[PDB]
Design a protein around this ligand. Structure first.
Ligand SMILES: Oc1c(Cl)cc(Cl)cc1Sc1cc(Cl)cc(Cl)c1O
Length: 461
């Protein structure tokens, strides 16, 4: 069976949630279901980005990083898939997976996901980045009501998952230390508490898993085969040798037209063998504009949907002008966040002046959008790693770096304004009075960010 059709290559970049959906044309588009989520984080990892940016890597830093990374991540991906999960999203050291089930099946599916989780922890026992650096994971699990939001325009589409269970999975992840599997309160509440030994987490309703202790006669394999009965797209029969049913997709112009919109133009070029398969693995100077939109209530897709859609329409317009691109959209703890990048796009002059001006315009327009309570934008510039991360059958373009995290942290620790780093400040070729120098705040993940600035803009206001 031939399987290397462009449609199949495109679907590698997408979860089944999109690949096998049937969305109306309307934007936004909302859908509601139940399932279990797994949010996975790899340790020892800001440490790698540093290792690999050093001159010791002789200009093959991006290459070696992408390699060592995919080696470990693609092992995580195979597990998730074999355990019947759908990998929703990657970014950096982290990936999100979903086992979408009917509400009666949640209890049993939780047991699968827990087992999957302990097997992931077992991959990395006795396992190091380098001599003297352990690689470990932290896993958060959640279960419940989940909303999909799809937004975009006629040529580009994005999705997010929303709701308290998504919020719960992020909270369980943040609590988790290395080697932990943390359950949300609702996940603990819905699980088969006869099989699952836990301990409490101080100042938290969430729980940590110690052991999976099934009864004397329980057979995990037969229990899992019974759970696959409820999985629409688990590969089987003649296709039981395959990690994803998506690998059997056949040409279909309409579906391809739909899917390609989720994928960046430079990936499509590569998919089409019109660009070298290695061209995207790089260390490149870019400017990151990280835009955060806070809402009164970030679990109600009917509320935040239209606003995200409205904001997207503007952001995409302002970026086409100023020569940037949306790379990924995120739901953090607080808000919807757009990860925008200038430079790797064309490497253009006035990149910095343009990134700033583009931020202020986004900021002004978005602050006037109905349900948006607050807008926050962080702007940082520097060398970041770019590349396609994951498995052959499931992978996504991502950006990784101290500057990516710096912009992400600025927009959280300096809400309501546009902030920029020193690189951006000094290389802007704008007058100093378009800025204010800010209080130095201590920020999670960041060591000597350097002086930070508010982009005040042209007038006194
Ligand atoms: O901050 C994130 C990183 Cl580093 C990786 C991934 Cl896969 C996701 C997030 S935030 C986020 C979390 C959930 Cl639970 C769902 C969505 Cl739609 C997100 O963007």
């Amino acid at each position: 069976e031939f399987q290397d059709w462009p449609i199949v290559r495109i679907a590698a970049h997408l979860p089944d949630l999109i690949v096998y959906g049937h969305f109306s044309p309307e934007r936004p588009f909302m859908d509601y279901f139940d399932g279990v989520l797994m949010f996975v984080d790899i340790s020892g990892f800001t440490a790698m980005t540093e290792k690999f940016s050093s001159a010791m890597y002789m200009d093959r830093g991006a290459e070696q990083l992408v390699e060592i990374l995919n080696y470990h991540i693609s092992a995580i991906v195979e597990k998730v898939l074999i355990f019947g999960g759908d990998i929703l999203k990657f970014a950096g050291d982290a990936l999100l997976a979903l086992w979408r089930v009917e509400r009666k099946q949640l209890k049993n599916i939780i047991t699968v996901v827990i087992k999957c989780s302990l097997e992931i922890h077992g991959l990395f026992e006795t396992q190091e980045w380098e001599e003297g650096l352990d690689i470990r994971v932290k896993i958060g699990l959640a279960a419940g009501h989940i909303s999909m939001l799809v937004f975009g325009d006629e040529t580009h589409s994005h999705f997010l998952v929303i709701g308290q269970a998504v919020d719960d999975v992020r909270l369980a992840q943040n609590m988790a230390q290395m080697n932990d599997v943390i359950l949300s309160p609702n996940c603990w509440q819905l699980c088969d508490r006869s099989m699952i030994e836990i301990e409490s987490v101080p100042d938290q309703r969430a729980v940590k898993v110690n052991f999976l202790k099934p009864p004397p006669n329980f057979n995990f394999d037969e229990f899992f085969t019974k759970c696959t009965t409820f999985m629409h797209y688990y590969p089987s029969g003649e296709h039981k040798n395959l990690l994803r049913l998506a690998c059997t997709l056949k040409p279909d112009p309409e579906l391809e037209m739909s899917l390609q919109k989720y994928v960046m133009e430079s990936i499509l070029k590569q998919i089409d063998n019109k660009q070298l398969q290695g061209y995207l693995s790089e260390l490149r100077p870019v400017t990151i504009v990280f835009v955060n939109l806070m809402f009164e209530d970030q679990d109600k897709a009917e509320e935040i949907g239209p606003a995200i859609q409205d904001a997207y329409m503007h952001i995409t317009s302002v970026l086409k002008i100023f020569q940037g691109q949306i790379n990924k959209v995120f739901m953090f703890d607080k808000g919807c966040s757009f990860l925008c990048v200038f430079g790797f796009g064309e490497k253009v002059p006035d990149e910095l002046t343009h990134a700033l001006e583009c931020a202020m315009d986004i900021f002004d327009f978005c602050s006037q959008v109905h349900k948006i309570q607050t807008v926050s934008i962080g702007v940082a510039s520097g060398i970041v790693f770019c590349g396609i991360v994951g498995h052959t059958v499931r992978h996504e373009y991502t950006v990784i770096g101290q500057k990516v995290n710096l912009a992400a942290r600025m927009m959280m620790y300096y809400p309501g304004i546009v902030t920029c780093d020193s690189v951006t400040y000094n290389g802007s070729n704008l007058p100093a009075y378009f800025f204010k120098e800010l209080p130095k705040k201590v920020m999670k993940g960041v060591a000597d960010s350097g002086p930070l600035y508010q982009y005040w803009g042209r007038t006194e206001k």
